[PDB]
Design a protein around this nucleic acid. Structure first.
Lengths: 368, 149, 133, 149
DNA sequence: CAAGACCAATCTTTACACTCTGTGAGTATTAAAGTTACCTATAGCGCCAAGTGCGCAAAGGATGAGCTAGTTTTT
């Protein structure tokens, strides 16, 4: 794709910035009065106003522009058809497993790297007179000058709509380099967001050596990225990643299996047990699940003891339906690839039957 | 008796998997190029199995660096034949040492008995990788296994 | 023989890189006398078209001819060369082109050829054969 | 305009160098296999110059890991033509960018005046390396130079 | 703490300039035709003006209604 002046005049900016084009005025940047500063632990999330000229431009860029630039198959995050299960699937054929993480992935993306990556797909011309270029005008809708990070200048912040696509486009080069490095060693490599998973099917201690870490660090130093030394895992014949267990006993032509730990399913089992023991829905929805109806959210008093009950029932049924959808997604993944343990399949079939029975009982009780 | 054929990033394939084969599998369609590409992939794999010098296949896209061909063989009847106490021959013992030796010495005394000797189906997986510099790599580094397969 | 030509086409063992039937059909079905074209005049026209100095393409052609000396062109070869220099470009598609050209050219002439086609559906989807008909 | 051809560890060559070529060269001998191998080496090199997919040549012995083909071209006439204050054309100014330069910008003002003598010859060298994994390496990593040569 | 290893494609080819029509020794030297040339597309619902919008979210009757929202990963 090659975006020209008319494309930005009609498609990218149909009505938001049409006033600034005929008047021959430069496109303004995003001011500090239009972005929120949500905080979560040691993380800062930037939220833009839902009614702003830049939000519509970002959505149009995401749908029409940042969806056709080719990517690398090793990236399985924020891409249509990608999933965590597809991120774990290729490593079932390996006997040794290694995991790596990138420290401050979004905060360390250089803006000039983004500009260079997006330059070939944008025509080199002046959008507004002889003062502002088309590339700069497009790029002013994705960056932000962080008041807390003025030392680093302006960066692409997490919480915007166009950040993941830009991250994938920027990191395509590093993905290609790492894949080329791993191909010669016979190591399967996959990436989800900023997490890298490496699998070795042969009997060797390459993944447990410091040489692999040094090589990955040297590769990542071209674009200024660093690894996190507190999240380095290297094991053999079994690995656990956020409750997903991948096992392979070893041997020539051996196929591993993927299952879920018991701790991964602990909350749903507790909810099912509480529901089968006739526990009030308020306690179930407040203790196990983190859903609570604050009194401030109430707008009109009207009637009191009829909306809380239906709200809690809807939240419970939505939670159960979502977890059922997750389990049947696992079942569909098994049907497509056949890399799931049989006993786990029996267990999840029983759990699905129990969940469906509980949902039917909840619906019948609500109707009565 | 092949069970699964997987092709990733080769010719006109991005990620194509064929399984559940029957005796009289029939292929129809309008895209004859796809059938020709599948035939070429199979012939290339079987030529590389027998150590023949052939031109590597092309890539669907140049934004990747690998092309993989995966084959799965159902080695169930051969395992039953070899592991029987009645058969004492050179070929049976050689087959056991080549196919079922490495994968069986890493198991304890619980999985071997009453867990893999009743109805289980044994599978053997072989992967061929083509790099960007026209280099060919195997998942198993043993020519004897490839010759026996 | 020259009033009722016979054309035979084999579809199974067909060479797609050979266009001899097309050239024969074009040469036979013409209403122009190509012998009135002056070779010297055409060579002079080409030389004047491409020249940094008057009389340079003629010298090149003469030097080439002085060492490529072979049998002179026949009439059919000359008309084929003229058609090739006039047109802009050189299994099922070949047969369709043959039939369409035969139908189109045999409209202002009193020559009626007869064409035999063997197995037109070799290696064709049924919809392709229906579309051909 | 070609002087040196060197082959190391390929087919039936250990280390063979051919130079001092004349206008007419006659090849005689009872070892026709050597002539065929030389023809194959030349054709393989010129097919790799034009980016064509061909089978890599075999090694004379397996106790090595590389196979080298070296070509040396005489570029005196082209250097005299391009570097004259008489020819201002698109093709003249492109050969100096691709074939020449990157070797005169690294010289001071005393080597250039001494390199303009009427009794000087300019040479260009290309090296093709074949590895054990059927990989191809070039001494100059620029397709434009290969296309121009 | 620094570090070799810094993507693919960006449209595709092809090709001497001069005065002399056969020959050329720059302190840093591609470019103009031809042939193409690609597609992006929409969200709650209903209504009347039929998509460029307006109203409303109580019916209904132009601003009381009433008013929830899945899992997991990255983070």
């Amino acid at each position: 794709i090659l975006v020209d002046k008319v494309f930005y005049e009609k498609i990218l900016s149909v009505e938001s910035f049409k006033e600034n084009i005929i008047t021959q005025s430069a496109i303004p940047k995003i001011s500090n009065k239009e972005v929120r500063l949500i905080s979560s632990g040691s993380k800062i999330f930037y939220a833009i106003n839902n009614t702003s000229p830049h939000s519509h431009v970002q959505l149009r860029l995401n749908r029409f522009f940042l969806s056709h630039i080719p990517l690398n198959s090793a990236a399985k995050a924020f891409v249509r058809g990608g999933s965590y299960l597809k991120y774990l699937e290729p490593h079932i054929y390996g006997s040794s497993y290694c995991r790596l993480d990138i420290s401050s992935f979004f905060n360390n993306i250089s803006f000039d790297d983004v500009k260079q990556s997006l330059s070939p797909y944008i025509k080199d011309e002046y959008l507004i007179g002889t003062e502002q270029k088309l590339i700069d005008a497009i790029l002013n809708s994705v960056g932000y000058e962080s008041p807390i990070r003025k030392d680093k200048g302006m960066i692409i912040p997490m919480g915007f709509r166009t950040s993941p696509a830009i991250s994938n486009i920027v990191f395509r080069k590093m993905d290609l380099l790492i894949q080329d490095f791993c191909a010669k060693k016979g190591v399967i490599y996959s990436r989800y967001a900023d997490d890298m998973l490496f699998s070795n099917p042969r009997e060797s201690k390459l993944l447990m050596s410091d040489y692999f870490i040094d090589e990955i660090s040297s590769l990542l130093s071209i674009m200024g990225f660093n690894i996190n030394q507190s999240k380095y895992i290297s094991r053999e014949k079994e690995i656990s990643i956020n409750g997903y267990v991948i096992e392979n006993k070893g041997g020539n032509g051996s196929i591993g299996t993927i299952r879920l730990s018991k701790s991964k399913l602990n909350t749903v089992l507790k909810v099912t047990h509480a529901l089968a023991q006739n526990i009030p829905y308020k306690n179930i929805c407040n203790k196990y699940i983190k859903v609570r109806l604050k009194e401030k959210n109430i707008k009109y008093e009207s009637k009191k003891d009829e909306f809380e009950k239906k709200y809690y029932r809807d939240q419970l049924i939505n939670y159960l339906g979502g977890y059922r959808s997750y389990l049947i997604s696992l079942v569909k993944f098994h049907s497509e690839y056949k890399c799931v343990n049989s006993d786990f399949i029996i267990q999840i079939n029983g759990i699905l039957n129990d969940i469906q029975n509980h949902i039917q009982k909840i619906k019948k009780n609500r109707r009565l | 008796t092949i069970e699964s054929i997987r092709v990733k990033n080769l010719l006109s394939f991005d990620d194509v998997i064929l399984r559940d084969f029957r005796d009289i599998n029939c292929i129809i369609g309008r895209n004859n190029v796809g059938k020709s590409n599948l035939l070429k992939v199979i012939r290339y794999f079987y030529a590389k199995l027998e150590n023949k010098k052939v031109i590597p296949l092309d890539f669907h896209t140049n934004y990747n660096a690998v092309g993989e061909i995966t084959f799965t063989f159902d080695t169930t009847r051969i395992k039953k034949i070899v592991t029987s106490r009645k058969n004492n021959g050179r070929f049976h013992k050689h087959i056991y040492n080549t196919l079922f030796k490495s994968s069986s010495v890493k198991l304890n005394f619980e999985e071997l008995i009453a867990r893999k000797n009743s109805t289980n189906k044994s599978f053997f997986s072989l992967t061929l990788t083509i790099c960007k510099d026209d280099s060919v790599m195997w998942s198993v580094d043993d020519p004897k296994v490839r010759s026996l397969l | 023989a020259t009033l009722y030509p016979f054309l035979y086409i084999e579809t199974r063992h067909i060479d797609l890189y050979d266009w001899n039937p097309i050239w024969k059909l074009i040469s036979n079905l013409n209403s122009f006398n190509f012998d009135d074209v002056d070779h010297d005049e055409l060579v002079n026209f080409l030389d004047e078209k491409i020249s940094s100095r008057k009389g340079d393409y003629k010298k090149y052609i003469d030097r080439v001819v002085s060492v490529i000396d072979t049998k002179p062109y026949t009439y059919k070869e000359k008309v084929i060369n003229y058609i090739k220099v006039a047109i802009k470009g050189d299994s099922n598609k070949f047969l369709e082109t043959l039939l369409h050209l035969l139908i189109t050219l045999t409209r202002t002439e009193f020559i009626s050829p007869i064409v035999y086609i063997d197995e037109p559906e070799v290696g064709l989807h049924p919809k392709l054969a229906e579309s051909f008909v």
